[PDB]
Amino acid sequence: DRMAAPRAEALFDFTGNSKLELNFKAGDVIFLLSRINKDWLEGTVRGATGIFPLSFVKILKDFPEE
């Protein structure tokens, strides 16, 4: 895609615990790798991967749901 791919702008600064948990900053913006359930999602930002709460990010684009 690289045109309308998924991405959410970090509204605040998050800091996961382990690798499984992602840690971004206010204004990091992730590409979103996938969804966990509804309140938690996955994405890679700042060379870091893991999961993060959707309540701490502004979904600027949803995943490619055909």
Side-chain angles (χ1 to χ4, degrees), residues 19-50:
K19 57 210 85 200
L20 273 65
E21 301 215 329
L22 178 61
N23 49 87
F24 55 72
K25 305 279 204 285
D28 251 25
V29 190
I30 327 92
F31 251 44
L32 322 186
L33 274 128
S34 249
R35 170 264 286 290
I36 315 307
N37 297 296
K38 46 170 220 187
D39 312 338
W40 314 322
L41 329 173
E42 184 128 60
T44 175
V45 55
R46 280 194 94 187
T49 351

PDB file of all heavy atoms in Angstrom, residues 19-50:
ATOM      1  N   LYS A  19       9.138  -6.879  25.892  1.00  0.00           N
ATOM      2  CA  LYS A  19       9.106  -6.805  24.436  1.00  0.00           C
ATOM      3  C   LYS A  19       7.677  -6.919  23.915  1.00  0.00           C
ATOM      4  O   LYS A  19       7.287  -6.215  22.982  1.00  0.00           O
ATOM      5  CB  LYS A  19       9.970  -7.914  23.829  1.00  0.00           C
ATOM      6  CG  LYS A  19       9.561  -9.310  24.266  1.00  0.00           C
ATOM      7  CD  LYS A  19      10.753 -10.253  24.303  1.00  0.00           C
ATOM      8  CE  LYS A  19      11.504 -10.150  25.622  1.00  0.00           C
ATOM      9  NZ  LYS A  19      12.895 -10.670  25.510  1.00  0.00           N
ATOM     10  N   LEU A  20       6.899  -7.805  24.526  1.00  0.00           N
ATOM     11  CA  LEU A  20       5.511  -8.010  24.124  1.00  0.00           C
ATOM     12  C   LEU A  20       4.729  -6.702  24.184  1.00  0.00           C
ATOM     13  O   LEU A  20       3.733  -6.531  23.482  1.00  0.00           O
ATOM     14  CB  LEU A  20       4.848  -9.054  25.024  1.00  0.00           C
ATOM     15  CG  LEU A  20       5.007 -10.512  24.591  1.00  0.00           C
ATOM     16  CD1 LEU A  20       6.467 -10.933  24.658  1.00  0.00           C
ATOM     17  CD2 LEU A  20       4.146 -11.423  25.455  1.00  0.00           C
ATOM     18  N   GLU A  21       5.189  -5.781  25.027  1.00  0.00           N
ATOM     19  CA  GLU A  21       4.532  -4.488  25.175  1.00  0.00           C
ATOM     20  C   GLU A  21       5.332  -3.389  24.481  1.00  0.00           C
ATOM     21  O   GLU A  21       6.529  -3.228  24.724  1.00  0.00           O
ATOM     22  CB  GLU A  21       4.357  -4.147  26.657  1.00  0.00           C
ATOM     23  CG  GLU A  21       3.547  -5.178  27.426  1.00  0.00           C
ATOM     24  CD  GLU A  21       2.695  -4.555  28.515  1.00  0.00           C
ATOM     25  OE1 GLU A  21       3.109  -3.515  29.069  1.00  0.00           O
ATOM     26  OE2 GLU A  21       1.616  -5.108  28.814  1.00  0.00           O
ATOM     27  N   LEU A  22       4.662  -2.635  23.617  1.00  0.00           N
ATOM     28  CA  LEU A  22       5.309  -1.550  22.885  1.00  0.00           C
ATOM     29  C   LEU A  22       5.420  -0.300  23.752  1.00  0.00           C
ATOM     30  O   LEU A  22       4.642  -0.109  24.685  1.00  0.00           O
ATOM     31  CB  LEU A  22       4.528  -1.233  21.609  1.00  0.00           C
ATOM     32  CG  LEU A  22       5.068  -0.080  20.761  1.00  0.00           C
ATOM     33  CD1 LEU A  22       6.479  -0.387  20.282  1.00  0.00           C
ATOM     34  CD2 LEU A  22       4.149   0.189  19.580  1.00  0.00           C
ATOM     35  N   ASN A  23       6.393   0.549  23.434  1.00  0.00           N
ATOM     36  CA  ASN A  23       6.604   1.783  24.182  1.00  0.00           C
ATOM     37  C   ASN A  23       6.875   2.951  23.240  1.00  0.00           C
ATOM     38  O   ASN A  23       7.972   3.083  22.697  1.00  0.00           O
ATOM     39  CB  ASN A  23       7.772   1.617  25.157  1.00  0.00           C
ATOM     40  CG  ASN A  23       8.998   1.020  24.495  1.00  0.00           C
ATOM     41  OD1 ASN A  23       9.824   1.737  23.931  1.00  0.00           O
ATOM     42  ND2 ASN A  23       9.121  -0.301  24.562  1.00  0.00           N
ATOM     43  N   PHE A  24       5.868   3.798  23.052  1.00  0.00           N
ATOM     44  CA  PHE A  24       5.998   4.956  22.174  1.00  0.00           C
ATOM     45  C   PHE A  24       5.941   6.254  22.975  1.00  0.00           C
ATOM     46  O   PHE A  24       5.904   6.236  24.206  1.00  0.00           O
ATOM     47  CB  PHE A  24       4.891   4.946  21.118  1.00  0.00           C
ATOM     48  CG  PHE A  24       3.508   4.863  21.697  1.00  0.00           C
ATOM     49  CD1 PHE A  24       2.948   5.952  22.345  1.00  0.00           C
ATOM     50  CD2 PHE A  24       2.769   3.696  21.595  1.00  0.00           C
ATOM     51  CE1 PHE A  24       1.675   5.879  22.879  1.00  0.00           C
ATOM     52  CE2 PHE A  24       1.496   3.616  22.127  1.00  0.00           C
ATOM     53  CZ  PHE A  24       0.949   4.710  22.771  1.00  0.00           C
ATOM     54  N   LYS A  25       5.935   7.378  22.268  1.00  0.00           N
ATOM     55  CA  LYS A  25       5.883   8.685  22.910  1.00  0.00           C
ATOM     56  C   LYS A  25       4.797   9.556  22.285  1.00  0.00           C
ATOM     57  O   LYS A  25       4.337   9.289  21.175  1.00  0.00           O
ATOM     58  CB  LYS A  25       7.239   9.386  22.799  1.00  0.00           C
ATOM     59  CG  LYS A  25       8.395   8.562  23.338  1.00  0.00           C
ATOM     60  CD  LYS A  25       8.491   8.659  24.851  1.00  0.00           C
ATOM     61  CE  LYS A  25       9.902   8.370  25.339  1.00  0.00           C
ATOM     62  NZ  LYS A  25      10.222   6.917  25.285  1.00  0.00           N
ATOM     63  N   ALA A  26       4.393  10.598  23.003  1.00  0.00           N
ATOM     64  CA  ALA A  26       3.364  11.509  22.517  1.00  0.00           C
ATOM     65  C   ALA A  26       3.763  12.124  21.180  1.00  0.00           C
ATOM     66  O   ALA A  26       4.524  13.090  21.133  1.00  0.00           O
ATOM     67  CB  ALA A  26       3.096  12.599  23.544  1.00  0.00           C
ATOM     68  N   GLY A  27       3.245  11.558  20.094  1.00  0.00           N
ATOM     69  CA  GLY A  27       3.559  12.064  18.772  1.00  0.00           C
ATOM     70  C   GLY A  27       4.510  11.158  18.016  1.00  0.00           C
ATOM     71  O   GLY A  27       5.199  11.600  17.096  1.00  0.00           O
ATOM     72  N   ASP A  28       4.549   9.889  18.403  1.00  0.00           N
ATOM     73  CA  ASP A  28       5.425   8.918  17.756  1.00  0.00           C
ATOM     74  C   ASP A  28       4.792   8.387  16.473  1.00  0.00           C
ATOM     75  O   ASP A  28       5.455   8.270  15.444  1.00  0.00           O
ATOM     76  CB  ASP A  28       5.728   7.759  18.708  1.00  0.00           C
ATOM     77  CG  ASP A  28       7.161   7.777  19.203  1.00  0.00           C
ATOM     78  OD1 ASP A  28       7.765   8.869  19.229  1.00  0.00           O
ATOM     79  OD2 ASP A  28       7.678   6.699  19.564  1.00  0.00           O
ATOM     80  N   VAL A  29       3.504   8.065  16.544  1.00  0.00           N
ATOM     81  CA  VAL A  29       2.781   7.547  15.389  1.00  0.00           C
ATOM     82  C   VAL A  29       3.314   6.180  14.976  1.00  0.00           C
ATOM     83  O   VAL A  29       4.465   6.052  14.557  1.00  0.00           O
ATOM     84  CB  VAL A  29       2.877   8.509  14.189  1.00  0.00           C
ATOM     85  CG1 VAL A  29       1.924   8.079  13.084  1.00  0.00           C
ATOM     86  CG2 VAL A  29       2.591   9.937  14.627  1.00  0.00           C
ATOM     87  N   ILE A  30       2.470   5.161  15.095  1.00  0.00           N
ATOM     88  CA  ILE A  30       2.857   3.803  14.731  1.00  0.00           C
ATOM     89  C   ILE A  30       2.215   3.383  13.413  1.00  0.00           C
ATOM     90  O   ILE A  30       1.278   4.023  12.935  1.00  0.00           O
ATOM     91  CB  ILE A  30       2.463   2.794  15.825  1.00  0.00           C
ATOM     92  CG1 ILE A  30       2.559   3.444  17.207  1.00  0.00           C
ATOM     93  CG2 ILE A  30       3.350   1.560  15.751  1.00  0.00           C
ATOM     94  CD1 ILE A  30       1.265   4.076  17.669  1.00  0.00           C
ATOM     95  N   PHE A  31       2.725   2.302  12.831  1.00  0.00           N
ATOM     96  CA  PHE A  31       2.201   1.795  11.568  1.00  0.00           C
ATOM     97  C   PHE A  31       1.139   0.726  11.809  1.00  0.00           C
ATOM     98  O   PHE A  31       0.410   0.341  10.895  1.00  0.00           O
ATOM     99  CB  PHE A  31       3.334   1.223  10.714  1.00  0.00           C
ATOM    100  CG  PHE A  31       3.662   2.061   9.512  1.00  0.00           C
ATOM    101  CD1 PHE A  31       3.766   3.439   9.619  1.00  0.00           C
ATOM    102  CD2 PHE A  31       3.865   1.472   8.275  1.00  0.00           C
ATOM    103  CE1 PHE A  31       4.068   4.214   8.515  1.00  0.00           C
ATOM    104  CE2 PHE A  31       4.167   2.241   7.168  1.00  0.00           C
ATOM    105  CZ  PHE A  31       4.268   3.614   7.287  1.00  0.00           C
ATOM    106  N   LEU A  32       1.061   0.249  13.047  1.00  0.00           N
ATOM    107  CA  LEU A  32       0.090  -0.779  13.410  1.00  0.00           C
ATOM    108  C   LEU A  32       0.378  -2.084  12.676  1.00  0.00           C
ATOM    109  O   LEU A  32       0.300  -2.149  11.449  1.00  0.00           O
ATOM    110  CB  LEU A  32      -1.327  -0.303  13.091  1.00  0.00           C
ATOM    111  CG  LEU A  32      -1.613   1.178  13.347  1.00  0.00           C
ATOM    112  CD1 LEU A  32      -3.087   1.482  13.129  1.00  0.00           C
ATOM    113  CD2 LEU A  32      -1.187   1.567  14.755  1.00  0.00           C
ATOM    114  N   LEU A  33       0.710  -3.123  13.437  1.00  0.00           N
ATOM    115  CA  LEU A  33       1.007  -4.429  12.859  1.00  0.00           C
ATOM    116  C   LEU A  33      -0.244  -5.301  12.812  1.00  0.00           C
ATOM    117  O   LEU A  33      -0.451  -6.056  11.862  1.00  0.00           O
ATOM    118  CB  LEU A  33       2.101  -5.128  13.667  1.00  0.00           C
ATOM    119  CG  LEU A  33       3.540  -4.784  13.287  1.00  0.00           C
ATOM    120  CD1 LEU A  33       4.334  -4.369  14.517  1.00  0.00           C
ATOM    121  CD2 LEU A  33       4.207  -5.965  12.595  1.00  0.00           C
ATOM    122  N   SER A  34      -1.075  -5.191  13.844  1.00  0.00           N
ATOM    123  CA  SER A  34      -2.305  -5.970  13.921  1.00  0.00           C
ATOM    124  C   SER A  34      -3.113  -5.589  15.158  1.00  0.00           C
ATOM    125  O   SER A  34      -2.680  -4.767  15.966  1.00  0.00           O
ATOM    126  CB  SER A  34      -1.985  -7.466  13.948  1.00  0.00           C
ATOM    127  OG  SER A  34      -2.407  -8.099  12.752  1.00  0.00           O
ATOM    128  N   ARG A  35      -4.289  -6.192  15.298  1.00  0.00           N
ATOM    129  CA  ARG A  35      -5.158  -5.916  16.435  1.00  0.00           C
ATOM    130  C   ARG A  35      -5.198  -7.105  17.391  1.00  0.00           C
ATOM    131  O   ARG A  35      -5.137  -8.259  16.964  1.00  0.00           O
ATOM    132  CB  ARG A  35      -6.573  -5.587  15.955  1.00  0.00           C
ATOM    133  CG  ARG A  35      -7.597  -5.521  17.075  1.00  0.00           C
ATOM    134  CD  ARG A  35      -8.343  -6.837  17.226  1.00  0.00           C
ATOM    135  NE  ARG A  35      -9.311  -7.043  16.152  1.00  0.00           N
ATOM    136  CZ  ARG A  35     -10.428  -6.337  16.023  1.00  0.00           C
ATOM    137  NH1 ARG A  35     -10.719  -5.383  16.897  1.00  0.00           N
ATOM    138  NH2 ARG A  35     -11.258  -6.584  15.017  1.00  0.00           N
ATOM    139  N   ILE A  36      -5.300  -6.816  18.683  1.00  0.00           N
ATOM    140  CA  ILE A  36      -5.349  -7.861  19.698  1.00  0.00           C
ATOM    141  C   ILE A  36      -6.787  -8.257  20.011  1.00  0.00           C
ATOM    142  O   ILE A  36      -7.168  -9.418  19.866  1.00  0.00           O
ATOM    143  CB  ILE A  36      -4.656  -7.415  20.999  1.00  0.00           C
ATOM    144  CG1 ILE A  36      -3.326  -6.727  20.685  1.00  0.00           C
ATOM    145  CG2 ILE A  36      -4.437  -8.607  21.919  1.00  0.00           C
ATOM    146  CD1 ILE A  36      -2.414  -7.549  19.802  1.00  0.00           C
ATOM    147  N   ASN A  37      -7.583  -7.284  20.440  1.00  0.00           N
ATOM    148  CA  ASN A  37      -8.981  -7.530  20.773  1.00  0.00           C
ATOM    149  C   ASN A  37      -9.847  -6.326  20.414  1.00  0.00           C
ATOM    150  O   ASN A  37     -10.676  -6.393  19.506  1.00  0.00           O
ATOM    151  CB  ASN A  37      -9.125  -7.849  22.263  1.00  0.00           C
ATOM    152  CG  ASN A  37      -8.389  -9.115  22.657  1.00  0.00           C
ATOM    153  OD1 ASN A  37      -8.728 -10.209  22.205  1.00  0.00           O
ATOM    154  ND2 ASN A  37      -7.377  -8.971  23.503  1.00  0.00           N
ATOM    155  N   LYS A  38      -9.648  -5.226  21.131  1.00  0.00           N
ATOM    156  CA  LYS A  38     -10.407  -4.005  20.887  1.00  0.00           C
ATOM    157  C   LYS A  38      -9.788  -2.823  21.627  1.00  0.00           C
ATOM    158  O   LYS A  38      -9.740  -1.709  21.106  1.00  0.00           O
ATOM    159  CB  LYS A  38     -11.862  -4.190  21.325  1.00  0.00           C
ATOM    160  CG  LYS A  38     -12.009  -4.849  22.685  1.00  0.00           C
ATOM    161  CD  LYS A  38     -13.441  -4.780  23.186  1.00  0.00           C
ATOM    162  CE  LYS A  38     -13.498  -4.479  24.676  1.00  0.00           C
ATOM    163  NZ  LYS A  38     -14.886  -4.565  25.207  1.00  0.00           N
ATOM    164  N   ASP A  39      -9.315  -3.074  22.842  1.00  0.00           N
ATOM    165  CA  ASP A  39      -8.696  -2.031  23.652  1.00  0.00           C
ATOM    166  C   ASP A  39      -7.178  -2.062  23.512  1.00  0.00           C
ATOM    167  O   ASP A  39      -6.492  -1.108  23.878  1.00  0.00           O
ATOM    168  CB  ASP A  39      -9.089  -2.196  25.121  1.00  0.00           C
ATOM    169  CG  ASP A  39     -10.581  -2.393  25.304  1.00  0.00           C
ATOM    170  OD1 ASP A  39     -11.346  -2.006  24.396  1.00  0.00           O
ATOM    171  OD2 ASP A  39     -10.985  -2.935  26.354  1.00  0.00           O
ATOM    172  N   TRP A  40      -6.661  -3.164  22.980  1.00  0.00           N
ATOM    173  CA  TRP A  40      -5.223  -3.319  22.793  1.00  0.00           C
ATOM    174  C   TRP A  40      -4.896  -3.644  21.340  1.00  0.00           C
ATOM    175  O   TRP A  40      -5.609  -4.408  20.689  1.00  0.00           O
ATOM    176  CB  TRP A  40      -4.685  -4.420  23.709  1.00  0.00           C
ATOM    177  CG  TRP A  40      -5.183  -4.316  25.118  1.00  0.00           C
ATOM    178  CD1 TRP A  40      -5.388  -3.170  25.833  1.00  0.00           C
ATOM    179  CD2 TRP A  40      -5.537  -5.401  25.983  1.00  0.00           C
ATOM    180  NE1 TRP A  40      -5.849  -3.477  27.091  1.00  0.00           N
ATOM    181  CE2 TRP A  40      -5.950  -4.839  27.208  1.00  0.00           C
ATOM    182  CE3 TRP A  40      -5.549  -6.790  25.843  1.00  0.00           C
ATOM    183  CZ2 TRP A  40      -6.367  -5.621  28.282  1.00  0.00           C
ATOM    184  CZ3 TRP A  40      -5.963  -7.565  26.909  1.00  0.00           C
ATOM    185  CH2 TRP A  40      -6.368  -6.979  28.116  1.00  0.00           C
ATOM    186  N   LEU A  41      -3.813  -3.061  20.837  1.00  0.00           N
ATOM    187  CA  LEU A  41      -3.391  -3.290  19.459  1.00  0.00           C
ATOM    188  C   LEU A  41      -1.885  -3.521  19.382  1.00  0.00           C
ATOM    189  O   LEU A  41      -1.188  -3.469  20.394  1.00  0.00           O
ATOM    190  CB  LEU A  41      -3.782  -2.100  18.581  1.00  0.00           C
ATOM    191  CG  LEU A  41      -5.048  -1.349  18.993  1.00  0.00           C
ATOM    192  CD1 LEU A  41      -5.221  -0.094  18.152  1.00  0.00           C
ATOM    193  CD2 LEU A  41      -6.268  -2.250  18.869  1.00  0.00           C
ATOM    194  N   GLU A  42      -1.392  -3.773  18.174  1.00  0.00           N
ATOM    195  CA  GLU A  42       0.032  -4.011  17.966  1.00  0.00           C
ATOM    196  C   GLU A  42       0.593  -3.060  16.911  1.00  0.00           C
ATOM    197  O   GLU A  42      -0.111  -2.655  15.988  1.00  0.00           O
ATOM    198  CB  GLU A  42       0.274  -5.460  17.542  1.00  0.00           C
ATOM    199  CG  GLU A  42       1.744  -5.817  17.406  1.00  0.00           C
ATOM    200  CD  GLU A  42       2.115  -7.067  18.182  1.00  0.00           C
ATOM    201  OE1 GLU A  42       1.538  -8.137  17.895  1.00  0.00           O
ATOM    202  OE2 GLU A  42       2.981  -6.974  19.078  1.00  0.00           O
ATOM    203  N   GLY A  43       1.867  -2.709  17.057  1.00  0.00           N
ATOM    204  CA  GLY A  43       2.502  -1.810  16.112  1.00  0.00           C
ATOM    205  C   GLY A  43       3.980  -1.624  16.390  1.00  0.00           C
ATOM    206  O   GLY A  43       4.452  -1.897  17.495  1.00  0.00           O
ATOM    207  N   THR A  44       4.716  -1.162  15.385  1.00  0.00           N
ATOM    208  CA  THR A  44       6.151  -0.944  15.525  1.00  0.00           C
ATOM    209  C   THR A  44       6.504   0.528  15.345  1.00  0.00           C
ATOM    210  O   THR A  44       6.248   1.114  14.293  1.00  0.00           O
ATOM    211  CB  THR A  44       6.949  -1.780  14.507  1.00  0.00           C
ATOM    212  OG1 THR A  44       8.341  -1.456  14.591  1.00  0.00           O
ATOM    213  CG2 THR A  44       6.449  -1.530  13.092  1.00  0.00           C
ATOM    214  N   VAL A  45       7.093   1.122  16.378  1.00  0.00           N
ATOM    215  CA  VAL A  45       7.483   2.526  16.332  1.00  0.00           C
ATOM    216  C   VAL A  45       8.817   2.749  17.037  1.00  0.00           C
ATOM    217  O   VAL A  45       9.104   2.123  18.057  1.00  0.00           O
ATOM    218  CB  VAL A  45       6.415   3.427  16.982  1.00  0.00           C
ATOM    219  CG1 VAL A  45       6.123   2.969  18.403  1.00  0.00           C
ATOM    220  CG2 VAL A  45       6.861   4.880  16.961  1.00  0.00           C
ATOM    221  N   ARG A  46       9.629   3.646  16.484  1.00  0.00           N
ATOM    222  CA  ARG A  46      10.932   3.952  17.059  1.00  0.00           C
ATOM    223  C   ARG A  46      11.797   2.696  17.144  1.00  0.00           C
ATOM    224  O   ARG A  46      12.545   2.509  18.103  1.00  0.00           O
ATOM    225  CB  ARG A  46      10.768   4.566  18.451  1.00  0.00           C
ATOM    226  CG  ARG A  46      10.409   6.042  18.426  1.00  0.00           C
ATOM    227  CD  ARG A  46      10.583   6.681  19.796  1.00  0.00           C
ATOM    228  NE  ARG A  46      11.900   7.294  19.950  1.00  0.00           N
ATOM    229  CZ  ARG A  46      12.345   7.801  21.093  1.00  0.00           C
ATOM    230  NH1 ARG A  46      11.583   7.769  22.178  1.00  0.00           N
ATOM    231  NH2 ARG A  46      13.555   8.342  21.155  1.00  0.00           N
ATOM    232  N   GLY A  47      11.688   1.841  16.133  1.00  0.00           N
ATOM    233  CA  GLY A  47      12.464   0.614  16.113  1.00  0.00           C
ATOM    234  C   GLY A  47      12.066  -0.342  17.219  1.00  0.00           C
ATOM    235  O   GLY A  47      12.808  -1.269  17.544  1.00  0.00           O
ATOM    236  N   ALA A  48      10.893  -0.118  17.800  1.00  0.00           N
ATOM    237  CA  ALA A  48      10.396  -0.967  18.875  1.00  0.00           C
ATOM    238  C   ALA A  48       9.040  -1.567  18.520  1.00  0.00           C
ATOM    239  O   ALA A  48       8.169  -0.884  17.980  1.00  0.00           O
ATOM    240  CB  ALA A  48      10.304  -0.177  20.172  1.00  0.00           C
ATOM    241  N   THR A  49       8.866  -2.849  18.827  1.00  0.00           N
ATOM    242  CA  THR A  49       7.616  -3.541  18.539  1.00  0.00           C
ATOM    243  C   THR A  49       6.919  -3.974  19.824  1.00  0.00           C
ATOM    244  O   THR A  49       7.518  -3.973  20.897  1.00  0.00           O
ATOM    245  CB  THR A  49       7.851  -4.779  17.653  1.00  0.00           C
ATOM    246  OG1 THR A  49       9.201  -4.790  17.175  1.00  0.00           O
ATOM    247  CG2 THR A  49       6.890  -4.790  16.474  1.00  0.00           C
ATOM    248  N   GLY A  50       5.647  -4.345  19.705  1.00  0.00           N
ATOM    249  CA  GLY A  50       4.889  -4.777  20.865  1.00  0.00           C
ATOM    250  C   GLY A  50       3.434  -4.359  20.794  1.00  0.00           C
ATOM    251  O   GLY A  50       2.964  -3.897  19.755  1.00  0.00           O
TER     252      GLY A  50
END
